[PDB]
Amino acid sequence: MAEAAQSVDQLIKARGKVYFGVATDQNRLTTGKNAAIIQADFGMVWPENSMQWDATEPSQGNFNFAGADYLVNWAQQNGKLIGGGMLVWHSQLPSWVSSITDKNTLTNVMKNHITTLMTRYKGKIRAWDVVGEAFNEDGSLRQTVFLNVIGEDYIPIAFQTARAADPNAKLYIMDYNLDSASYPKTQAIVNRVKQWRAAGVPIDGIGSQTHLSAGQGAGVLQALPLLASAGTPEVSILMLDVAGASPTDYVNVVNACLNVQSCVGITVFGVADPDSWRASTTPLLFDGNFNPKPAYNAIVQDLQQ
């Protein structure tokens, strides 16, 4: 009953991009047709939760890598690239980290978390989301424990530490609602990343978590070039999904990446609609029967060359 298809990963590489990827983890790989679809159609996998802080360091200095190892091992078995993260994020943070008020203590904790995770997989990981969701909607920095205890230097320090732990990895800052050039948040992240790179922070990429509502794909055609103007080596579309999964929206986002030389690829936030955090809007590229949806076939048509 499986349908004939083409790999969007193979097609996007033929157009000069690095990958078309997907978020997943052990329980998805064990169920449905996820592993088979990822094997056939996607070239990079990202851990949805198994590399988050609550999963990997549930108490200080006590690391748990079972779920992360599963994904890394599966990807290597199956010839897939691997992305990791998020290393520094206020969500899915254990309470013991929020307990800390001493600046030097939290710095050491953050640096240890980054170094331990990145060293375990040194040379194996294409890219790490070093800092995620650091900005408020108005463009100011989000008042997380890291900002409140360490200050603004937590971002410089996090990236310097990551570069040392694995110099081969691409180091990303990531955020959401960067989907319109008109947003104060989009302009602010660009301004701050330019200034951070002038301060020597090794921010290799900006990753735009592109959770779109219907019709918002068109806006990414202007938002992504604006993000590229920060001058980072790379940008990327991360955690893509689209309410309604209209082919027009999905093709607009793909074309945004094709239009930007620093865009290295696109990652979709899961395989099949029923597993989406917004499943009721059927926002992914495969349906509940694990068959490719019209948007998948529209991407395929757009990437033919």
Side-chain angles (χ1 to χ4, degrees), residues 27-37 272 275 288 290:
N27 294 177
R28 300 277 68 75
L29 289 166
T30 51
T31 54
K33 275 311 232 63
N34 296 294
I37 291 170
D275 296 304
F290 288 96

Short mmCIF file of all heavy atoms in Angstrom, two decimals, residues 27-37 272 275 288 290:
data_model
loop_
_atom_site.label_atom_id
_atom_site.label_comp_id
_atom_site.label_asym_id
_atom_site.label_seq_id
_atom_site.Cartn_x
_atom_site.Cartn_y
_atom_site.Cartn_z
N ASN A 27 10.68 6.62 20.25
CA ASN A 27 9.35 6.05 20.23
C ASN A 27 8.69 6.21 18.86
O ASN A 27 7.89 5.35 18.46
CB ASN A 27 8.51 6.64 21.36
CG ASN A 27 9.03 6.24 22.76
OD1 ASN A 27 8.50 6.69 23.77
ND2 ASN A 27 10.07 5.40 22.81
N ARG A 28 9.03 7.25 18.11
CA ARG A 28 8.52 7.34 16.74
C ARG A 28 9.20 6.33 15.84
O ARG A 28 8.57 5.71 14.98
CB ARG A 28 8.73 8.76 16.18
CG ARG A 28 8.05 9.86 16.97
CD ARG A 28 6.59 10.02 16.59
NE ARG A 28 5.78 8.88 17.01
CZ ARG A 28 5.39 8.65 18.26
NH1 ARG A 28 5.74 9.48 19.24
NH2 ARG A 28 4.66 7.58 18.53
N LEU A 29 10.52 6.18 15.99
CA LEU A 29 11.24 5.24 15.15
C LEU A 29 10.77 3.81 15.35
O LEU A 29 10.96 2.99 14.45
CB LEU A 29 12.75 5.35 15.45
CG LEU A 29 13.38 6.63 14.94
CD1 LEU A 29 14.75 6.85 15.55
CD2 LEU A 29 13.45 6.59 13.42
N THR A 30 10.18 3.50 16.50
CA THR A 30 9.69 2.17 16.79
C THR A 30 8.28 1.90 16.27
O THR A 30 7.82 0.76 16.39
CB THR A 30 9.65 1.96 18.33
OG1 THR A 30 8.97 3.06 18.94
CG2 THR A 30 11.05 1.87 18.89
N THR A 31 7.59 2.90 15.72
CA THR A 31 6.17 2.80 15.46
C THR A 31 5.82 3.26 14.06
O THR A 31 6.56 3.99 13.40
CB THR A 31 5.35 3.62 16.48
OG1 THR A 31 5.82 4.98 16.50
CG2 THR A 31 5.48 3.04 17.88
N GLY A 32 4.65 2.82 13.60
CA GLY A 32 4.16 3.24 12.29
C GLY A 32 5.15 2.96 11.20
O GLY A 32 5.85 1.95 11.20
N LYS A 33 5.23 3.90 10.24
CA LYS A 33 6.18 3.83 9.14
C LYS A 33 7.22 4.92 9.23
O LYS A 33 7.82 5.28 8.21
CB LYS A 33 5.44 3.92 7.79
CG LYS A 33 4.89 2.59 7.27
CD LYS A 33 5.98 1.50 7.33
CE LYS A 33 6.17 0.77 6.01
NZ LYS A 33 6.64 1.67 4.91
N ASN A 34 7.44 5.47 10.43
CA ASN A 34 8.36 6.59 10.55
C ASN A 34 9.76 6.23 10.07
O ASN A 34 10.36 6.97 9.29
CB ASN A 34 8.40 7.08 12.00
CG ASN A 34 7.08 7.61 12.45
OD1 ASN A 34 6.61 8.63 11.94
ND2 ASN A 34 6.45 6.92 13.38
N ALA A 35 10.31 5.13 10.58
CA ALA A 35 11.67 4.76 10.19
C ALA A 35 11.78 4.56 8.68
O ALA A 35 12.75 5.00 8.06
CB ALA A 35 12.11 3.50 10.93
N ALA A 36 10.76 3.95 8.07
CA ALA A 36 10.79 3.70 6.63
C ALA A 36 10.72 4.99 5.82
O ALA A 36 11.42 5.13 4.81
CB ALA A 36 9.66 2.75 6.25
N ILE A 37 9.91 5.94 6.26
CA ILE A 37 9.81 7.21 5.56
C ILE A 37 11.10 7.99 5.73
O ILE A 37 11.61 8.59 4.78
CB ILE A 37 8.60 8.01 6.07
CG1 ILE A 37 7.32 7.31 5.62
CG2 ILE A 37 8.68 9.46 5.58
CD1 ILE A 37 6.07 7.86 6.25
N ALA A 272 4.38 12.31 10.38
CA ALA A 272 2.97 12.14 10.06
C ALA A 272 2.07 13.01 10.94
O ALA A 272 2.29 13.13 12.15
CB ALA A 272 2.56 10.67 10.22
N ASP A 275 0.94 12.68 14.79
CA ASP A 275 1.95 12.82 15.83
C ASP A 275 2.34 14.26 16.08
O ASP A 275 3.16 14.52 16.97
CB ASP A 275 3.17 11.97 15.45
CG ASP A 275 2.84 10.49 15.42
OD1 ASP A 275 2.36 9.97 16.45
OD2 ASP A 275 3.02 9.84 14.36
N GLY A 288 -2.06 10.44 8.08
CA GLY A 288 -2.17 9.41 9.10
C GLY A 288 -1.89 8.01 8.59
O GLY A 288 -1.59 7.12 9.39
N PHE A 290 0.59 7.47 6.65
CA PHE A 290 2.00 7.56 6.31
C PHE A 290 2.22 7.65 4.80
O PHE A 290 3.25 7.22 4.28
CB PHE A 290 2.78 6.39 6.91
CG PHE A 290 2.94 6.49 8.40
CD1 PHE A 290 2.05 5.83 9.24
CD2 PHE A 290 3.94 7.25 8.94
CE1 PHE A 290 2.19 5.92 10.60
CE2 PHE A 290 4.09 7.34 10.32
CZ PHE A 290 3.21 6.69 11.14
#
